[PDB]
Amino acid sequence: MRVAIPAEDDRGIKSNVSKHFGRSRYFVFVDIEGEDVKNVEVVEVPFGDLPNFIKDHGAKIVLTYGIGRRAIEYFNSLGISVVTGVYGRISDVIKAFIGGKLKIDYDWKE
Amino acid sequence: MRVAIPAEDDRGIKSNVSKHFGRSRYFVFVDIEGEDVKNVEVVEVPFGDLPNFIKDHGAKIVLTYGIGRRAIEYFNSLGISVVTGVYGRISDVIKAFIGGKLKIDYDWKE
């Protein structure tokens, strides 16, 4: 399926998850088929804009560090699932995600 | 992909989303391919048990009404996304989910 990830840099799968969704200016869209990463797409954000931006790009899951409750709810209303507390290099996150061992910062709100 | 939903009854896609994940005794697993529902599987729960139960059944998304923060985090650590605030007949939820128009109870915590 297609997974969306806010990036800190325009470095694609070598960038880190941006700590603030919403203020982030690059997103990485990763097409996953089984254990296999079939496509990486690295685009920039323009300027419920952001959620609609993500939905318009086909992403059905969003992996983020921090994101507001309202944004999560807006995502959810669009049938999009959000994972919070994710940090680190996006390449590592995608490998963790595929293998059921994601590293979550439980304390991302404090 | 495969979506897991806690059911109030053993009525499958005719049951409602159970209002309490965790105390629920039936789950519905729905295989979705595009706009198409390819398979429905209606099983019962035994007796991070529940999350592992869901992961062991191949579900990568969980749609729930209420669920605890700890359970969500545990799901997330297993690379599983959770949607909260979902209620109603499971057949209606699945149709909403596929079309980007899910109806969310923003106030499911109060």
Short mmCIF file of C-alpha atoms in Angstrom, two decimals:
data_model
loop_
_atom_site.label_atom_id
_atom_site.label_comp_id
_atom_site.label_asym_id
_atom_site.label_seq_id
_atom_site.Cartn_x
_atom_site.Cartn_y
_atom_site.Cartn_z
CA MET A 1 0.00 0.00 0.00
CA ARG A 2 1.18 3.57 0.03
CA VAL A 3 2.70 5.17 3.10
CA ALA A 4 3.29 8.92 3.55
CA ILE A 5 6.05 10.31 5.81
CA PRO A 6 6.85 13.99 6.62
CA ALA A 7 10.55 14.68 5.91
CA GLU A 8 12.86 17.16 7.57
CA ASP A 9 14.98 17.66 4.42
CA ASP A 10 14.54 16.94 0.73
CA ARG A 11 16.79 13.90 1.22
CA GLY A 12 14.06 11.25 0.49
CA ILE A 13 14.55 7.97 2.36
CA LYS A 14 17.82 9.39 3.76
CA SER A 15 16.00 12.24 5.56
CA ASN A 16 14.64 12.02 9.10
CA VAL A 17 10.96 12.09 10.01
CA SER A 18 10.18 15.77 10.56
CA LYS A 19 9.34 16.30 14.18
CA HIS A 20 6.36 18.59 13.30
CA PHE A 21 3.79 17.40 10.79
CA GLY A 22 2.10 20.37 9.21
CA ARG A 23 5.09 22.66 9.30
CA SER A 24 7.06 20.10 7.28
CA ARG A 25 7.86 21.00 3.64
CA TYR A 26 8.75 17.62 2.13
CA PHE A 27 6.88 14.33 2.17
CA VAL A 28 8.00 10.87 1.17
CA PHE A 29 5.46 8.42 -0.34
CA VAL A 30 6.52 4.82 -0.23
CA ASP A 31 4.84 2.02 -2.11
CA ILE A 32 5.09 -1.22 -0.20
CA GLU A 33 4.21 -4.66 -1.60
CA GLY A 34 4.84 -7.42 0.96
CA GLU A 35 8.40 -7.06 2.26
CA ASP A 36 9.18 -5.00 -0.85
CA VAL A 37 9.56 -1.26 -1.31
CA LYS A 38 8.39 -0.81 -4.92
CA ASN A 39 8.58 2.96 -5.30
CA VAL A 40 9.79 6.04 -3.41
CA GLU A 41 8.40 9.46 -4.31
CA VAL A 42 9.83 12.61 -2.82
CA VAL A 43 7.66 15.73 -3.34
CA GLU A 44 7.34 19.13 -1.72
CA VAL A 45 4.36 20.66 0.02
CA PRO A 46 2.51 23.64 -1.59
CA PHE A 47 2.74 27.31 -0.20
CA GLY A 48 -7.64 20.48 5.62
CA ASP A 49 -4.95 21.20 3.01
CA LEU A 50 -2.29 18.74 4.18
CA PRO A 51 -4.62 15.80 4.72
CA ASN A 52 -6.17 16.36 1.35
CA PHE A 53 -2.69 16.67 -0.10
CA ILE A 54 -1.87 13.22 1.34
CA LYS A 55 -5.19 11.63 0.22
CA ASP A 56 -4.73 13.13 -3.27
CA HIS A 57 -1.39 11.30 -3.42
CA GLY A 58 -2.97 7.91 -2.70
CA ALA A 59 -1.44 7.45 0.78
CA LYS A 60 -3.59 5.40 3.14
CA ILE A 61 -1.17 5.42 6.06
CA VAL A 62 0.83 8.32 7.52
CA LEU A 63 3.81 7.81 9.80
CA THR A 64 4.63 10.82 11.92
CA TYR A 65 6.44 11.95 15.06
CA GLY A 66 4.19 14.76 16.29
CA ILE A 67 0.89 15.81 14.76
CA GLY A 68 -2.14 17.55 16.19
CA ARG A 69 -5.31 15.82 17.32
CA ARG A 70 -7.41 17.77 14.85
CA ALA A 71 -5.11 16.69 11.92
CA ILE A 72 -5.34 13.01 13.02
CA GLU A 73 -9.12 13.28 13.19
CA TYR A 74 -9.25 14.97 9.78
CA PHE A 75 -7.05 12.11 8.39
CA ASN A 76 -9.31 9.57 9.96
CA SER A 77 -12.40 11.17 8.42
CA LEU A 78 -10.67 10.64 5.02
CA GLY A 79 -10.12 6.94 5.81
CA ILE A 80 -6.43 7.59 6.46
CA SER A 81 -4.64 6.04 9.49
CA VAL A 82 -1.93 7.90 11.30
CA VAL A 83 0.97 6.47 13.37
CA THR A 84 2.50 8.92 15.93
CA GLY A 85 5.83 8.73 17.81
CA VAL A 86 7.90 7.60 14.79
CA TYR A 87 11.39 9.14 14.47
CA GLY A 88 14.70 8.55 12.77
CA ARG A 89 15.94 7.94 9.22
CA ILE A 90 13.09 7.25 6.94
CA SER A 91 14.85 4.26 5.34
CA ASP A 92 15.10 2.65 8.83
CA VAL A 93 11.49 3.45 9.64
CA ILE A 94 10.22 1.76 6.43
CA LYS A 95 12.26 -1.38 7.18
CA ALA A 96 10.94 -1.37 10.78
CA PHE A 97 7.40 -0.78 9.56
CA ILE A 98 7.47 -3.74 7.07
CA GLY A 99 8.79 -6.06 9.86
CA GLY A 100 6.29 -5.29 12.66
CA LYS A 101 9.02 -3.71 14.88
CA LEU A 102 8.50 0.01 14.77
CA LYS A 103 10.37 2.10 17.38
CA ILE A 104 7.87 4.53 18.98
CA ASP A 105 8.62 7.54 21.15
CA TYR A 106 5.86 7.06 23.70
CA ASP A 107 6.63 10.49 25.12
CA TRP A 108 6.40 12.51 21.88
CA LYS A 109 3.81 14.85 23.51
CA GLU A 110 6.06 16.02 26.36
CA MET B 1 -4.96 -4.65 2.47
CA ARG B 2 -6.44 -6.26 5.53
CA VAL B 3 -8.52 -4.32 8.03
CA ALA B 4 -9.49 -5.57 11.50
CA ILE B 5 -12.65 -4.38 13.31
CA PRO B 6 -13.88 -5.29 16.84
CA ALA B 7 -17.49 -6.56 16.65
CA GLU B 8 -20.22 -6.33 19.24
CA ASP B 9 -21.92 -9.57 18.09
CA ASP B 10 -20.91 -12.54 15.97
CA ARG B 11 -22.93 -10.99 13.14
CA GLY B 12 -19.89 -10.27 10.83
CA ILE B 13 -20.35 -7.24 8.58
CA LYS B 14 -23.89 -6.88 9.98
CA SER B 15 -22.60 -6.31 13.55
CA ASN B 16 -21.74 -2.92 15.00
CA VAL B 17 -18.24 -1.80 15.96
CA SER B 18 -17.87 -2.81 19.60
CA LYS B 19 -17.60 0.29 21.69
CA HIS B 20 -14.74 -1.21 23.81
CA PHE B 21 -11.75 -2.74 22.06
CA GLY B 22 -10.12 -5.27 24.31
CA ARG B 23 -13.29 -6.43 25.99
CA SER B 24 -14.73 -7.33 22.57
CA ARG B 25 -15.08 -11.07 21.77
CA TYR B 26 -15.45 -11.05 17.98
CA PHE B 27 -13.32 -9.44 15.30
CA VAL B 28 -13.98 -8.97 11.61
CA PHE B 29 -11.04 -9.05 9.14
CA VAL B 30 -11.79 -7.50 5.80
CA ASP B 31 -9.61 -7.85 2.74
CA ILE B 32 -9.85 -4.77 0.58
CA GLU B 33 -8.47 -4.48 -2.97
CA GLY B 34 -9.20 -1.04 -4.48
CA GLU B 35 -12.93 -0.35 -4.12
CA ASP B 36 -13.45 -4.09 -3.66
CA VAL B 37 -14.09 -6.14 -0.54
CA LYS B 38 -12.48 -9.48 -1.47
CA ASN B 39 -12.95 -11.45 1.74
CA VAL B 40 -14.68 -11.18 5.12
CA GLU B 41 -13.48 -13.32 8.02
CA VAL B 42 -15.38 -13.46 11.27
CA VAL B 43 -13.44 -15.07 14.17
CA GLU B 44 -13.65 -15.03 17.94
CA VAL B 45 -11.10 -13.86 20.45
CA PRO B 46 -9.31 -16.42 22.72
CA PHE B 47 -10.05 -16.76 26.57
CA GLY B 48 -0.03 -7.68 24.28
CA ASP B 49 -2.38 -10.58 23.48
CA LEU B 50 -4.95 -8.71 21.37
CA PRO B 51 -2.47 -6.76 19.28
CA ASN B 52 -0.52 -9.89 18.61
CA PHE B 53 -3.77 -11.64 17.80
CA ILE B 54 -4.48 -8.94 15.18
CA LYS B 55 -0.90 -8.97 13.74
CA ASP B 56 -1.01 -12.79 13.59
CA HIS B 57 -4.12 -12.44 11.41
CA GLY B 58 -2.35 -10.20 8.88
CA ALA B 59 -4.31 -7.01 9.69
CA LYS B 60 -2.33 -3.82 9.13
CA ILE B 61 -5.13 -1.42 10.02
CA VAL B 62 -7.57 -1.53 12.95
CA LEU B 63 -10.78 0.48 13.02
CA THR B 64 -12.15 1.03 16.50
CA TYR B 65 -14.47 3.20 18.55
CA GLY B 66 -12.68 3.31 21.91
CA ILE B 67 -9.30 1.78 22.68
CA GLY B 68 -6.67 2.59 25.26
CA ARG B 69 -3.55 4.63 24.61
CA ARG B 70 -1.31 1.75 25.64
CA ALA B 71 -3.07 -0.62 23.13
CA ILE B 72 -2.66 1.96 20.31
CA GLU B 73 1.02 2.34 21.15
CA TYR B 74 1.47 -1.44 21.27
CA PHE B 75 -0.26 -1.66 17.82
CA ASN B 76 1.98 1.04 16.50
CA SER B 77 5.10 -0.75 17.73
CA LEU B 78 3.91 -3.74 15.61
CA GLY B 79 3.60 -1.49 12.53
CA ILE B 80 -0.19 -1.52 12.87
CA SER B 81 -2.25 1.71 12.48
CA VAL B 82 -5.33 2.30 14.52
CA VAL B 83 -8.36 4.52 13.69
CA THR B 84 -10.44 5.63 16.74
CA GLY B 85 -13.97 7.11 16.88
CA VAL B 86 -15.49 4.69 14.33
CA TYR B 87 -19.03 3.44 15.09
CA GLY B 88 -22.00 1.87 13.39
CA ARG B 89 -22.67 -1.17 11.20
CA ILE B 90 -19.48 -2.68 10.04
CA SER B 91 -20.73 -2.99 6.44
CA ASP B 92 -21.31 0.81 6.40
CA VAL B 93 -17.94 1.51 7.96
CA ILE B 94 -16.09 -0.53 5.28
CA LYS B 95 -17.93 1.30 2.49
CA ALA B 96 -17.13 4.65 4.17
CA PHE B 97 -13.52 3.62 4.69
CA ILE B 98 -12.98 2.64 0.99
CA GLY B 99 -14.47 6.03 -0.13
CA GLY B 100 -12.46 8.44 2.08
CA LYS B 101 -15.60 9.51 4.04
CA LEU B 102 -15.40 7.88 7.41
CA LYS B 103 -17.80 9.16 10.11
CA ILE B 104 -15.78 9.78 13.30
CA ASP B 105 -17.09 10.37 16.81
CA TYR B 106 -14.67 13.12 17.82
CA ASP B 107 -15.94 12.87 21.38
CA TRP B 108 -15.43 9.11 21.89
CA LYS B 109 -13.32 9.80 25.03
CA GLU B 110 -16.04 11.66 26.95
#
